[PDB]
Design a protein around this nucleic acid. Structure first.
Ligand SMILES: [Mg+2]
Ligand SMILES: [Mg+2]
Lengths: 140, 71, 188, 55
RNA sequence: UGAAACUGCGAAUGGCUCAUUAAAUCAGUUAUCGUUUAUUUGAUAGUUACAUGGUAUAACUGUGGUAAUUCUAGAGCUAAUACAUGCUUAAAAUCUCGACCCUUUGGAAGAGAUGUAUUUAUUAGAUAAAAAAUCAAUGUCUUCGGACUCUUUGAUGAUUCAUAAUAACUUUUCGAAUCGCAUGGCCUUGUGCUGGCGAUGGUUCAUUCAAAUUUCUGCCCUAUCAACUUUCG
């Protein structure tokens, strides 16, 4: 269901030449994210279009990198992860448990299910509250 | 017929003087814009004269076929 | 005026944020220029910085590109047929980015007869030397000469008129064109 | 008023744009010479790499 | 020398107060491959009547108005780094056409275009160890059967980056009609051609002063506040 939606879905500034009869009808552009992150094979042979995918779209990865555990996958192309941590109250000389929910973007190159641990990287501000992007999935 | 041709000739005689005055009044900056406006005015006058001649003669494709041909 | 501030909304938890400051000049927003078909009328808009931004109110012409042959020709725009953001901008015949117009096929054809030499639809020596030099490139998919039969091409618009003041785009190709004409026939 | 001084200033502007043009052109020519001899030395190093791998 | 006035610049700093504000400000820590940046500092532009175009006005003179304002009307002047026009430059290269030549394996007089900025489309922007077969194009020689005797750059962890080229595009952006000092050299003796020190102005890149959003973690009391947000995001 690639052209199911209302405008056409293409990578920007790519060209498929009709005059030259090629084997594949869609030339696809991809980049590696850096930091020793392997590009998944489904990004390269895939047919999806996403601007906010870090392997097919116009989004770089830079800044903090974080790890979490996903709780919500219930909405379109964005999932919500959860980082539990310990906060240290100095008067009582002992820690407090705390957690923060950050909603991260996910490309359709990842099959992320609730309970798995992901690895997120900072990107440009994608939406009102989304500022992150999933670059690695670990099965659990 | 002849009156419409005389009106088109008078419109062309006014438009030639208007285009010549616009070309003479232009500077080096706005000469290309004045030339584009004069060419658009000449094309619109020719289209209006052709439509007037077609109306004087009269008074006195689809994308589904493209889809069928493509499929 | 139009404040594009992010503190006047709610938070991520739905709480009502209080007001914090008066609206700022580094965060303003302008009223949109719903750009029509008409004679050339472009207003200058001064920006933040020492820069300047065109605002195309009424415009008619454009430098539209052909993807396959790599040419771009100054060509009049007839009217808007289809638009992805709203269906009501079609009703007002509005040029924006990706608003699709019908563009008349006269100067592309007049180049094409000078560069490929076969008429569509239905003598100087070096020129036929050149048309003997180009043989295999004369084939275009059937929808394009079907549009040449009426002399009206469909072209998308890639240049934003409200910033650049121009209206420049590209002619639809068989994949792009095929999907857009099937949903055009789904609308019609 | 046309004075000799404004003619001298116009002459100086013309002369300065001229000599700036030849100075940057000869700088470009010397750098083209440097890049050509650097690529020649690089091809010589490629040649000695190929004969040490051939032997 | 210099009152007034035009023009350029500053007045967006400083000074004061703490009313609003409880993930708001802020503190430490990131990011801008997500942006604008007067000034400073360094580079940056032979491609577009020239012994140097034009027009308004202030200041000033004169006439006025009202109780009253840092109020100003009418008339008469004149300047610019105000405003608005407007030429100039060297060679070389490459592409679009191309009068004629003859039938090959084709090659050409000549014409036009190619500074910078805006906008779109396309292309280049590569880098793991070696090889062979075919068809074209060429630089080629024929023992007209034949085959080779010579081409390939940056950065980042990351990019559609830097940048270049092509097709055009554009109420055509910029490419000095400015000013102060000493006034010098070269003769076909024209009052001809050259000629320094440095103030201002200017396109773009970089820097700097910054600005703007922005990442992680942190806030006093309250359940006699347990569910809140979505017609109006
Ligand atoms: Mg003095
Ligand atoms: Mg400077």
């Amino acid at each position: 269901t690639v052209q199911s939606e209302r405008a056409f879905q293409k990578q920007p500034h790519i060209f498929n030449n009709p005059k030259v009869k090629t084997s594949k009808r869609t030339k696809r552009w991809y980049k590696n994210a850096g930091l020793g992150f392997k590009t998944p094979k489904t990004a390269i042979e895939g047919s999806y279009i996403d601007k906010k995918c870090p392997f097919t779209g116009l989004v770089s990865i830079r800044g903090k990198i974080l790890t979490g555990t996903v709780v919500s996958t219930k909405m379109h192309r964005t999932i919500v992860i959860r980082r539990a941590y310990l906060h240290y109250i100095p008067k009582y000389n002992r820690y407090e448990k705390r957690h923060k929910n950050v909603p991260v973007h996910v490309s359709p190159a990842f099959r992320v299910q609730v309970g798995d641990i992901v690895t997120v990287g900072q990107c440009r501000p994608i939406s009102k509250t989304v500022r992150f992007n999933v670059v690695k999935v670990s099965a659990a | 017929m002849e009156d419409i041709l005389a009106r088109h000739r008078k419109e062309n005689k006014d438009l030639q003087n208007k285009i010549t005055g616009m070309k003479k009044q232009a500077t080096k900056s706005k000469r290309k814009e004045v030339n584009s406006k004069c060419l658009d005015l000449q094309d619109k006058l020719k289209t209006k004269q052709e439509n007037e001649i077609r109306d004087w003669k009269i008074a006195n494709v689809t994308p589904e076929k493209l889809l069928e041909q493509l499929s | 005026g139009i404040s594009r501030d992010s503190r006047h909304k709610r938070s991520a938890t739905g709480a009502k944020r209080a007001q914090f400051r008066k609206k700022r000049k580094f965060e303003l927003g302008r009223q949109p220029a719903n750009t029509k078909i008409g004679a050339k009328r472009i207003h200058s808009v001064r920006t933040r910085g020492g820069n300047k931004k065109y605002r195309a109110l009424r415009i008619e012409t454009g430098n539209f590109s052909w993807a396959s042959e790599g040419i771009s020709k100054k060509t009049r725009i007839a009217g808007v047929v289809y638009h992805p953001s709203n269906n009501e901008l079609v009703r007002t015949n509005t040029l924006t980015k990706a608003a699709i117009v019908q563009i008349d096929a006269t100067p592309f054809r007049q180049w094409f007869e000078a560069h490929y030499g076969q008429t569509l639809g239905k003598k100087s020596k070096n020129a036929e030397r050149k048309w003997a030099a180009r043989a295999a490139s004369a084939k275009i998919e059937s929808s394009v000469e079907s549009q040449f039969s009426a002399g009206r091409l469909y072209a998308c618009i890639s240049s934003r008129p409200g910033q650049s003041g121009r209206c420049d785009g590209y002619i639809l190709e068989g994949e792009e064109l095929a999907f857009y004409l099937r949903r055009l026939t789904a609308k019609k | 008023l046309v004075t000799p001084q404004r003619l001298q200033r116009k002459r100086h502007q013309r002369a300065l744009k001229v000599r700036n043009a030849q100075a940057q052109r000869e700088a470009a020519a010397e750098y083209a010479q440097l890049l050509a001899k650097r690529l020649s030395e690089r091809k010589a190093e490629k040649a000695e790499i190929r004969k040490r791998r051939a032997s």
